[PDB]
């Protein structure tokens, strides 16, 4: 059969990842530009809301030296790609969690619908991918949303999960964070609750 | 905004290292025990951030000058070069590639690194840049030394430089390590080893670049990087 | 009534899939995680089902006309034919051999297959029939073309045809998957490398047949079939 | 050493396992003559019962896709292996899943006592294998019944099972359905409770 | 209007199949037995149609629409795809490729076609393209059965899908036939075998391209065509 | 020696030629545009002619599955390339023996004089590529016109042929058919008056 | 693929062919019994006939050390296998070309009609095939008759000859030989009017 070039194996990013990836997070210092967690400014238009989650390992202990990145479409279901810290909103931010600070933070914007390549809509959702010592190669996952009912049932990502007690791992809870809007969306490496992981 | 137009081969799991991989002892109780959903291609997949605007200091790249604080670091001062392509050999310009390391005594910037070895009061081990017009990227550094961890009772890391690559998508996105040409520690290191197929190992191998080397100044070292190739979308919907 | 007469050499659960095959994803959790526990053979094993007075149809092992709906099915027009013999290479006579597949275009007939290929309106896929008195059995068909699965994110079965067959026990008893020859998919597909040994694999590939073949009409494969060695009771209680 | 000719090897039946042996739950015509889950006609000899149950996979989750085929001796501890939709019984059936309630049913007699080997009584069973997605080499258990239990405790072979508690897996539980006896044997492949699988 | 500015690689026609190959019967009767007159290449020869401005529709490319008579035709869904270049490895845009095959089945949709296997009424057999601005063609199809036909007593043809492609002249043009990896009918073929050489033979046989395939939906095949070598001119008439 | 990547192998074009390159002669429905038989529009500059012939194999019989293709210069001496439907004149064409019959028919122009690569001038020719079951690669000819005496006779390539009695092989003869000029090319692949064939 | 054990080859049965196989012919001594030509006695049911015929090489040449094996139906359209020599008629005989008897015989009746596989009757024919030195593997004919045209013309073994003159090769000429019923059946093994032959 036609053989492509293979692709470069994956490798942990390994428990020293925030020196490179999470310099604040790492109390290193920064430069002046980091891509990190506010992906919205307070001018974004759209709802604006507070994530946060813990992620625990298969003996239920908290992995506190993750580093999460996420993609999401803009309030419009637009995906912007043209990274600028200038921008009002990007769909692209970093985040981890630490010694010091065990739950992540995200500061954005709740998305907008994105059609699938049929032309069927999903439900509103952030895409996630997952680093870490002991993870080999990042873990990807979807972020939903609990108030999101009516589509979550119709998205045609979530149907491809075959038990419905799976899809309630994606699922994020409604709370609210000092009167602000907020999401705790926790991830499950392994056992008992494991998060859905895809693969594309 | 961005589109979707591109489909990305699909990754061969077994290429790479799978989640358990028992002798890596983090990966025991890290590593889902479900099987992954596959899900089709959709914009969420096929898009990713593209970095060209993101605002680079003038070192960035430079680990020997990015951490001046009176000297030069201690070290075997090395270029390390290469070029990042799609598995149809196409190169990827304007990609953010980003790195860190150890020192040269195999220490970490880190605080919770409390390995004896001192800590170099000129060096940070942190680079980045972008993909050049041509799929090339360039960074001058010293060679990391190799770092014990605790893992079996006597486990210590080949050198290693970590990489991160953006590509063109979230689908593209890898973390990986370099090794070096030569390194006896590589077919000891269960973190390499995490790779089932040796082939796959020999592609994180960086060989010495005398070409590339300035002479009497700094050695070179070749690593270059395969992204998933990317392919216009063909006959879908229809 | 049946009796105890007989003894099966054990299986080799080497040569034999092992339960826990991850890259079939399937198999994840449907795999005992407890050791099988091995009991002696007793009548009710070493006994089974004969189907010599089971009436059979016309048509059962002729799929090009059991599923007639005013014309022939579209397709590569297969004799699919061998000999079942034990491991001491015994015929097996009267045994019932059953088989099911997909049409030319790998759509299944079942109300859980969604493939956007089209089903063939005369086409069923299903056919019967018993071992002969010198162990040979012959079907009729379409060969099956490969089918998409939602393993993997692009995963295809090889061309296949699952064959049950019963033999002189439920000790012998067996559902395997025939593949054929020079298919390019074999190598690559989850189920048949569920099987660790490749000369295991190669036993369920089946061969073309040209000495077999209808001209003008129909080609052939041949597909022989190994059940347990059947030998008699010996030294027992004493 | 001597080594025989290798056994064919064994692969999964797949999910559309009932194309070929279970017609009607493909959704499918029937032949004039199908193997399946009567085994005893009204006037069989011996006590008549249903047998019924569902299969769990390691998550807890039906396996609404499972084919079974059971062997079992007459209710005068015959095996009665002349296969014929004509007998007054038949000691080999077979059922399936079905996909909705994830539920088999088989209609028999309780099977008398037949000797092991070497002479010794075993208690009443039913002799069964289970085959489906998932499964590359089909599974083999027993079903033996809750009110056999002086028989049970000294059966040869549930007593070359270690452990007491894994005992208990197979032995069936005394019910009733639309009134009449009944026995229900759920298979659990894997996790808690999992049923014990041989091997002979 | 067209003017002669190049020169073309003379064939080499032991390479090629020699025009009497006995075992396919009809080139007996169908072969010069007088030699080829060899003349210089002129305008005539160096020349041909660009087929740029012909009107294509829509589904000229694509055989699973171009017959629709009110369903999808049944049979293995494929891509074949490929690049021509010349024997310098020069891409060869904006090319005239045609194709065309019998169906799942091995039936020609043919008055001359009278084998028992059945037409499928929305499958017709043809399709044309034009190579892209980098050489490559695309078509969407059926896998062709095996084809039994009147030579030896029993002779069936493996899968095969005939090609034509113009190139940039009349010397260029080629007429030739796709066989498709592992099929076991191929060193079998008289047809096939009328080419001497085996590293010819394999030059024919298209490989499995799992990279180019619609997961979920069909397989595809990739066949590259290498037209003879154009060069300019160079010290003539001097 | 410079070896250069290999040109694929030529194949027969078979006896179901048709289907894909004569669509109508297959008993097939014809897309919107074709390339076929009528190079020239009734306006085109030049003498209107017809071109007919059958072919014969070594046993003298017709081959009835034949398939021509035809490039021919202008009225004018020039090659048209820009192939298109809406040309008053296109240099390329195709034509087919009928089955019945075996009778191809070509409706073009007398084609002007062209020079070989010395300068030297060629008498009027059409080139043509004959294909068909049994051929595995593709026949080249060349159909000149008897009423071409003089320039036949200094034509560079005919005098490439060592023979003058294979040069006649080549010389289509003048007739009429309806009425209108016409010039009959027989073309005899094997044994008597076989036809030239050329490599280049 | 499925490989059988290879046939043993043929060779070519050589100029002494007679000396084992047409004792007679040979001007050898003959055993008690010999398979010959008269296929049928006197009292054998149907049209009582003669056969003849010469052998050509391709140089028009006589072949005078040919030998022949007939098979073929008996007048009411049955073989006869039971060979024997008190029969009144057997389907098998053997003949010759000799240096002293150039042209051979066979005395035997005219056999009836034999369907195809199909069910498809064939025209009258007998079975032929021919050995001699210079041919490695023996040619395989049949002979048919010209007062059976009608028959002739719809057999379906004919009819798989392309050519219609090709089939006129295999139709044996009625005379009269000394007041009887006579047909001669020439072959040429090469060249001009090559006669058919047959692989099956
Ligand atoms: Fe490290
Ligand atoms: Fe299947
Ligand atoms: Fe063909
Ligand atoms: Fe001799």
Known sequence: PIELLPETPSQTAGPYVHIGLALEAAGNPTRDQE?????????????????????????????????????????????????????????????????????????????????????????????????????????????????????????????????????????????????????????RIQGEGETVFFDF | PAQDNSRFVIRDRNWHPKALTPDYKTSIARSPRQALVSIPQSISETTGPNFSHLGFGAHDHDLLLNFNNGGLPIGERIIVAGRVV???????????????????????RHKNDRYLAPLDPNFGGVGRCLTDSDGYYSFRTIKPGPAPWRNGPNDWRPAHIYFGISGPSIATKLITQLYFEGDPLIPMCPIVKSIANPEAVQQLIAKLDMNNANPMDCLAYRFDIVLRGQRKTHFENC
């Not at chain 1, 507070?50 to 030296?65: A, E, K, S």
Request: one cysteine or more; proline letters at 5%.
């Open chain 1, 35 to 187: 891509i990190w967690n506010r992906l919205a400014k307070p001018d974004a238009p759209g709802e604006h809301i507070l994530l946060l989650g813990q992620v625990y390992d298969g003996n239920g202990h908290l992995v506190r030296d993750s580093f999460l990145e996420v993609w999401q479409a803009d309030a419009n279901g637009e995906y912007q790609d043209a990274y600028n810290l200038e921008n009002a909103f990007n769909s692209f931010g970093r985040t981890a969690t630490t010694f010091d600070a065990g739950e992540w933070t995200l500061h954005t914007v709740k998305p907008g619908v994105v059609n699938n390549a049929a032309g069927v809509p999903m439900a509103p959702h952030i895409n996630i991918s997952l680093f870490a010592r002991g993870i080999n190669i990042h873990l990807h996952t979807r972020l939903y949303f609990d108030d999101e009912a009516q589509a979550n049932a119709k998205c045609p990502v979530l149907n491809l999960i075959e038990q419905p007690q799976r899809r309630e791992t994606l699922i994020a809870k409604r709370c609210e964070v000092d009167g602000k809007t907020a999401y705790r969306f926790d991830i």
């Open chain 2, 86 to 108: 799609d598995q149809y050999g196409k190169p990827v310009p304007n990609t953010l590639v980003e790195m860190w390391q150890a020192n040269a005594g195999g220490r970490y």
